Amino acid sequence: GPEMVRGQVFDVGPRYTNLSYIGEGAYGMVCSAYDNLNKVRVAIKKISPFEHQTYCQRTLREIKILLRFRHENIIGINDIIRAPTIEQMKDVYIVQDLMETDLYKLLKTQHLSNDHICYFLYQILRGLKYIHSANVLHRDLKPSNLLLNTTCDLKICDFGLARVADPDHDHTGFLTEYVATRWYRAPEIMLNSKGYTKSIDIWSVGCILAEMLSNRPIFPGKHYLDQLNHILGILGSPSQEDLNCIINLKARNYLLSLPHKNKVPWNRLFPNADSKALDLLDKMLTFNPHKRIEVEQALAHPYLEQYYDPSDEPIAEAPFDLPKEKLKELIFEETARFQP
Numbered sequence: 001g002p003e004m005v006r007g008q009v010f011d012v013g014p015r016y017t018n019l020s021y022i023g024e025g026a027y028g029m030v031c032s033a034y035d036n037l038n039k040v041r042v043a044i045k046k047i048s049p050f051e052h053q054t055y056c057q058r059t060l061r062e063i064k065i066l067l068r069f070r071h072e073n074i075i076g077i078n079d080i081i082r083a084p085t086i087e088q089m090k091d092v093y094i095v096q097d098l099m100e101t102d103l104y105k106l107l108k109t110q111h112l113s114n115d116h117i118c119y120f121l122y123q124i125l126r127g128l129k130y131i132h133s134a135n136v137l138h139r140d141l142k143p144s145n146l147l148l149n150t151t152c153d154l155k156i157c158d159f160g161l162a163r164v165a166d167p168d169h170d171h172t173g174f175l176t177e178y179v180a181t182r183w184y185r186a187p188e189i190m191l192n193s194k195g196y197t198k199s200i201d202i203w204s205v206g207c208i209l210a211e212m213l214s215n216r217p218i219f220p221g222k223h224y225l226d227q228l229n230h231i232l233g234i235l236g237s238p239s240q241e242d243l244n245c246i247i248n249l250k251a252r253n254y255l256l257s258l259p260h261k262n263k264v265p266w267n268r269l270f271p272n273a274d275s276k277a278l279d280l281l282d283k284m285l286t287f288n289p290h291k292r293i294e295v296e297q298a299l300a301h302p303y304l305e306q307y308y309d310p311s312d313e314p315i316a317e318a319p320f321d322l323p324k325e326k327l328k329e330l331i332f333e334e335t336a337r338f339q340p
């Protein structure tokens with residue numbers, strides 16, 4: 001019969017053998033396995049989305065995006081395992097490079113040298129340049145979605161919440177529900193934004209840089225609105241000019257109702273950080289999303305001068321409602337290339 005792990009079917013053989021439980025992920029069970037063809041261990045994640053339209057959507061999203069992207073700092077899909085027919089297909093297994101660790105695990109246990117911070121940040125931005133060049137937003141950047149190998153090469157993963165950019169339709173009302181991880185949400189999400197612009201991702205990167213500097217999340221909100229007052233507790237009260245950019249009255253009047261808060265200087269928050277790193281941090285964690293630094297400007301910042309080389313920071317060749325039944329079929333078609 002099929003391979004079993006923790007009392008569950010993990011049906012990947014006979015190419016993949018010698019399975020080891022790694023942990024549970026946003027999709028389900030993740031294991032490592034020996035790839036008898038490439039003579040190397042790999043990671044395999046098991047996905048079971050076919051009962052729910054939303055799951056079908058996140059799965060289809062990830063698969064389509066990862067199959068189209070090809071970049072050193074973005075996790076690829078090596079192989080996809082599933083039944084030969086739709087009728088028999090209950091699960092889909094996604095095979096990817098096995099990576100030693102991730103930035104979430106690393107930050108729990110390891111102090112990062114400035115040299116490491118700088119290299120990790122460069123790689124995150126290099127990958128993000130490619131993603132944004134494809135007119136795609138990742139929308140859930142955070143340490144656990146940044147994989148690292150034994151030599152600290154970094155790969156962005158999990159495109160389950162990704163979307164094509166849609167700035168013309170970004171405006172919404174105050175306190176609009178949002179799905180992406182709370183601690184890494186830009187302030188405008190809580191005020192007047194659907195998170196359909198590239199600036200949403202830059203905010204998340206800024207949060208990640210701050211977290212690398214101190215091993216603690218910079219804005220650890222406990223609930224939707226608490227997130228915003230963590231942010232304001234550090235950046236201080238928005239300027240009149242930045243308030244005037246928020247036309248929605250409920251959002252604006254909420255901000256006006258708050259007592260004045262002073263900005264906390266980055267160098268008091270991070271007294272041993274490199275000054276150039278803090279200058280770049282400030283530009284990524286800018287309150288007004290229109291004034292926030294863009295990915296290519298960030299790559300060109302003096303902090304990253306030892307790595308910056310636009311000719312070696314590639315872009316994508318081209319820019320990138322349905323019921324679950326049509327989705328199961330689309331997943332079936334999208335994964336066909338890996339048969340048998």
Ligand SMILES: N#Cc1c[nH]c2ncccc12
Pocket residue numbers: 022025030043045096097098099100101147
């Ligand atoms: N999902 C996923 C992974 C893709 N590669 C991995 N390496 C170590 C642990 C997890 C993974």
